[PDB]
Amino acid sequence: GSEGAATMATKIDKEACRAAYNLVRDDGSAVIWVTFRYDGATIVPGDQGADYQHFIQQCTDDVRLFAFVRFTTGDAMSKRSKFALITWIGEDVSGLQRAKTGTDKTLVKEVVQNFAKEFVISDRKELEEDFIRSELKKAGGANYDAQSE
Numbered sequence: 001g002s003e004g005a006a007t008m009a010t011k012i013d014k015e016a017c018r019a020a021y022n023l024v025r026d027d028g029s030a031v032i033w034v035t036f037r038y039d040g041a042t043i044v045p046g047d048q049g050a051d052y053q054h055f056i057q058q059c060t061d062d063v064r065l066f067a068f069v070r071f072t073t074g075d076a077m078s079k080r081s082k083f084a085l086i087t088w089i090g091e092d093v094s095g096l097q098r099a100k101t102g103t104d105k106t107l108v109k110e111v112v113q114n115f116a117k118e119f120v121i122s123d124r125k126e127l128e129e130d131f132i133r134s135e136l137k138k139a140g141g142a143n144y145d146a147q148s149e
Contacts, residue, residue: 003040006096012043012107020045021111024070025083035088036108037065043107052129059127061092064101066108068115069129071136082116082136085109091122098122 023031033055037046046065047058055067067086074080087105089098105118116139121127 004038005041007041010041010043010100010104010107012104012110013039013045014111016045017043017108017111020048021068023048024068025081025114033067033069035059035065035067037063043104056124056127056129059088059090059121059124061090064089064093064097066105066118067127068112069132071116071129071133073133073136073139082139083112083114084116084132084136085112085118086127086132087118087120088127089120089122 017036020034020036023029024034030050031048032050033052034048035046035055035058036043038044043066047055049055052069055069059065059067065088067088068083069086070081070083072079073082085105085108087102089101093101102120109118116136119132119135
């Protein structure tokens with residue numbers, strides 16, 4: 001590791017990404033969650049597993065990355081899933097990382113489109129899969145708030 005630098009450039013391992021986004025999107029590929037961290041100006045599939053407790057053990061105030069988790073919210077008509085791109089961002093990382101990590105989201109989204117929405121969390125207390133579900137349970141309301149200044 002020990003590979004990191006500041007640059008106005010960024011890419012995504014679509015190839016490696018798609019794989020991770022699938023290992024969870026699939027019926028039962030032995031995976032329900034997946035994280036996507038950077039390996040040097042390029043987003044790449046970080047951790048992966050079926051134990052949600054294993055994912056939260058990766059997100060800390062000294063790291064930031066996305067986390068695609070599957071959530072079964074199909075009990076009405078279909079049994080399909082909506083998932084959610086959990087964007088983690090250490091509450092200690094430099095403002096930039098937080099101001100950037102969010103922008104690079106457009107890259108990770110390229111692969112994750114079937115999901116529901118990206119959940120930008122900064123405190124583990126919110127990473128609680130329990131809190132995430134509630135969000136999908138309603139999957140209503142959007143920010144759409146910004147300024148051109």
